[PDB]
Amino acid sequence: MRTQWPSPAKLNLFLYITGQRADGYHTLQTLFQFLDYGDTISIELRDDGDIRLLTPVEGVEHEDNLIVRAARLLMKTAADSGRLPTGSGANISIDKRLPVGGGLGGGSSNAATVLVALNHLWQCGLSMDELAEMGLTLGADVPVFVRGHAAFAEGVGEILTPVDPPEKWYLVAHPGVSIPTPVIFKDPELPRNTPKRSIETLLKCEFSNDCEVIARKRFREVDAVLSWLLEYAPSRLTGTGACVFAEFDTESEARQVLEQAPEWLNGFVAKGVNLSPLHRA
Ligand SMILES: Nc1ncnc2c1ncn2[C@@H]1O[C@H](COP(=O)(O)OP(=O)(O)O)[C@@H](O)[C@H]1O
Ligand SMILES: Nc1nc(=O)n([C@H]2CCCS2)cc1C#CCNS(=O)(=O)C1CC1
Ligand SMILES: [Mg+2]
Ligand SMILES: [Mg+2]
């Protein structure tokens, strides 16, 4: 039997960099919300203990793909604690709508959906905390997707406090540039001193993304897309870019602006979701 599993995008509704730890990672205060939009992952169990991603993701080698890494991590962890039924395997295919990169968390959402689906399908019985703990080793973006709720996130992104932001409609645009996430976080001029504040202060302050100034300055493609959207609606970078979103109250306004957008916006429209489509499923 084949099962299908949502792998939604996320948005950083705001993103503040509070410092940088010794291991190079940055401490932050950010607010995750999911989008009801993303990839679909299909899984067929194998009985020969193998893991096969049948549908390649362009530019990513099989063994580098977060789908496969997540599956093998779960297999190793379950097997080291006697929770992996003999022969547990899987064929995995993905219908990929999300960009590879851009600050939408698509690869990390793929990792999270695979952890959750395989834990269920192999009957490994691992808890949320254990999965989120294993997800974190695959990237700081992975735990929010594993836990499945919109959340105020601190630490490096793993300290998650569920919250229910307004579920606005978003136009999400992908500038035609690839920004390696290491670039932004290694910039001298990135704010690393933004004062840590309470959720109440943050939820009342205007939402911004501390990384936007740098993405905009360094990538004219990002500045172009942001400048264009800002004429229509509040608009900000998500993640470290390059994607930018514009916030709307209704689907019709968001789609009307989208119908107007030049093709170089590479835009789609989707609704915010405080419960991940994966956990809804
Ligand atoms: N299934 C996957 N989908 C997208 N990217 C992946 C996947 N597996 C590994 N990656 C790697 O991660 C990067 C893009 O990941 P992604 O989570 O989409 O980043 P972003 O937060 O910028 O959206 C690429 O460098 C790619 O090598
Ligand atoms: N806290 C961090 N410090 C860092 O140095 N890095 C770099 C080093 C690894 C890849 S990039 C990432 C994070 C993270 C995170 C949580 N997910 S996130 O908020 O969507 C994304 C916008 C930040
Ligand atoms: Mg989805
Ligand atoms: Mg990611």
- Is the domain of 157 the same as that of 235? no
DSSP element (H, E) containing 107: helix 106-122
Using the mean position of ligand 3's atoms as its centre, give its distance from the Cα of residue 64 in Å.
23
- Is the domain of 35 the same as that of 131? yes
Which of 140, 164, 142 minimizes the C-alpha distance to 154? 140
Resolution (A): 1.9
Whole-angstrom distance between the N-terminal and C-terminal Cα of the chain?
17
Question: How many angstroms separate the CA atoms of 126 and 89, rounded?
Answer: 17
Mutation probe of ligand 2 site: the residue of 13, 18, 30, 214 with most atoms within 8 A of C-beta: 30
- In this structure, is residue 63 part of a structural domain? yes
Residue whose structure tokens are 């549908």: 55
Question: Active-site positions?
Answer: 10, 141
Which of 252, 255, 179, 271 minimizes the C-alpha distance to 222? 179
User: Domain of 40: which CATH number?
Assistant: 3.30.230.10
Preceding omega of 242 cis (within 30 degrees of 0): yes
Cβ-based neighbour number of residue 64 at 10 Å: 10
Nearest ligand to the C-alpha atom of residue 37: 3
- In this structure, is residue 209 part of a structural domain? yes
- In this structure, is residue 279 part of a structural domain? no
Which of 61, 128, 175, 125 minimizes the C-alpha distance to 276? 128
Q: How many domains does the chain have?
A: 2
- In this structure, is residue 200 part of a structural domain? yes
- In this structure, is residue 281 part of a structural domain? no
Check if the beta carbon of residue 72 is closer than 8 Å to that of residue 51. Answer: yes
Using the mean position of ligand 4's atoms as its centre, give its distance from the Cα of residue 272 in Å.
18
- In this structure, is residue 68 part of a structural domain? yes
Question: How many angstroms separate the CA atoms of 30 and 155, rounded?
Answer: 10
Last residue of a domain, one of 119, 144, 162: 162
- In this structure, is residue 278 part of a structural domain? no
- In this structure, is residue 280 part of a structural domain? no
Check if the beta carbon of residue 247 is closer than 8 Å to that of residue 235. Answer: yes
- Please enumerate in sequence order all residues whose Cβ is within 8 A of that of 34, keeping only pairs 6 or more positions apart, or say none: 8, 9, 10, 11, 145, 150, 272, 273, 274, 275, 276, 277
- Is the domain of 151 the same as that of 189? no
Question: How many angstroms separate the CA atoms of 246 and 254, rounded?
Answer: 8
- Is the domain of 24 the same as that of 156? yes
Q: Which domain holds residue 190?
A: 169-273
Q: What is the CA radius of gyration of the chain?
A: 19
Last residue of a domain, one of 112, 131, 162: 162
Pairing of strands 51-53, 89-95: parallel
